[PDB]
Design a protein around this ligand. Structure first.
Ligand SMILES: Nc1nc2[nH]c(S)nc2c(=O)[nH]1
Ligand SMILES: Nc1nc2[nH]c(S)nc2c(=O)[nH]1
Lengths: 267, 267
């Protein structure tokens, strides 16, 4: 099915063998500094190790979202260094800022993860190309008047691709993300879930990030820490509909669900 | 989609509104009696109440499987009486024996659940007709030389239908079950999972029972009490492939996964 592997400096991610699990690293900044003091970085490393032991294939590390420019680096850079040295797994870096991206890679990060899909700061894609790292382009926008949910997402993603490619990004460094929970009503989220398979016509691996998001809340009527089951359902449907990757919080539980899906669908 | 509801004496199960959850009632027989003493029956009632509070729509109660004839009744009959009076939900009774079935219904049971799909004791289907209760016909056999897994299951189920119908069972009292974990290699289980949608051409609602079964063990390499995630994956794929019902142990967790699936697929 994919005739190529994801190339990540020292690491090689096979796209045909299993749904790949990306572990969300939660950055808890020290209130008493702006930098990379012992507590934030040691907790980060701790968490990264736990996730590695629970089945994660990629550690995702993001500094601002939920900022400054200077601050993003000073807080993101020491964590990539430590997790890099102490955990043997590719790291993605979760930013839409070109500078931030750059520094992150030089610090050891391997994948770029841009929630603005290169629309943010198109320069990001040039960085992407320059280091030859895979870049995840997520669907997003600053409004939500849609002619047609699906047709628009596909158009939009495609607009991100154009930017990536016109910067020198190879098809094989491009991954897409439908951006569930961004720029969509709870209803539009469910519809996208229900039609995720349409992203495949674009020809690129797909990552899904629905972990504990708000729309799961809406359906189950349940707070952020009670969304394991709801997340799991979104994960399963995503694998059945063709996801190469899922970005989750609860790595132990989702690896098990992913691996059971993989066996059943025959990946 | 279904133009009719499941009719269950006092209760009415809608087939279009949600995936219906059937709760497996675990019968722990007192070692010191053969009948319906306080401990077995009170535990049973307790369990049934917990499952009702966690989202179950049907309580499944089975006495021998994992016997005598006389003993099955003496042990199954007092439980149907109590759970009936104390829990306001339809009960299915889990037996392949005509006598047992009969007595169970007279004791308040509403659905018959036959793991031998009327091949066991064809007379069961006559009971079924006589009381006009829905009867679940599960795929099973006493060997596992298959010409073609799927084509054979469909043929076999159909052979059960013939028996049901020739006893007077109305199409609307017929439910089918692919019998995962029965008469199939771990591999054949996965294949059936992967093609469950084929049972729909038969025109009848489908129930899936994969809760904590052995093939989940095989895939995850994990014991019976560590199969929540694996079960969940089988549940999700089943709802996506068209299940009207799932028979599970972990009712809280699966209701949540079912309800998230239902919202996404738009049931
Ligand atoms: N790729 C990706 N990155 C994310 N960062 C946040 S926050 N949410 C997401 C997401 O859903 N997908
Ligand atoms: N309908 C149904 N009944 C069952 N009884 C047992 S044990 N296992 C099952 C099952 O998988 N399905």
């Amino acid at each position: 099915k994919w005739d190529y592997d994801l190339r990540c400096g020292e690491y090689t991610l096979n796209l045909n063998e299993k749904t790949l699990i990306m572990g969300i690293l939660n950055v808890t900044p020290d209130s008493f500094s702006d930098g990379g003091s012992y507590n934030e970085v040691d907790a980060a490393v701790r968490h990264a190790k736990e996730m590695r032991d629970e089945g994660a294939h990629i550690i995702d590390i993001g500094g601002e979202s939920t900022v400054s420019v200077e601050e993003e680096i000073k807080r993101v850079v020491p964590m990539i260094q430590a997790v890099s040295k102490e955990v043997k797994l590719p790291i993605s870096i979760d930013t839409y800022k070109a500078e931030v991206a750059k520094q992150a890679i030089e610090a050891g990060a391997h994948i770029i993860n841009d929630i603005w899909g290169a629309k943010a700061e198109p320069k990001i894609a040039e960085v992407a190309a320059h280091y030859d790292v895979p870049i995840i382009l997520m669907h997003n926008r600053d409004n939500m008047n849609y002619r047609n949910l699906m047709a628009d997402m596909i158009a939009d993603l495609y607009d991100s691709i154009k930017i990536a490619k016109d910067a020198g990004v190879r098809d094989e460094n491009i991954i897409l993300d439908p951006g569930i929970g961004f720029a969509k009503t709870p209803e539009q989220n469910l519809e996208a879930m229900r039609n995720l398979e349409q992203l495949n016509v674009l020809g690129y691996p797909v990552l899904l990030g629905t972990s504990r998001k708000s729309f799961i809340g809406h359906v189950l009527d349940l707070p952020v820490e009670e969304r394991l089951e709801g997340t799991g359902a979104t994960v399963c449907l995503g694998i059945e509909k063709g996801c190469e990757f899922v970005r989750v919080h609860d790595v132990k539980e989702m690896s098990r669900m992913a691996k059971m899906m993989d066996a059943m669908i025959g990946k």
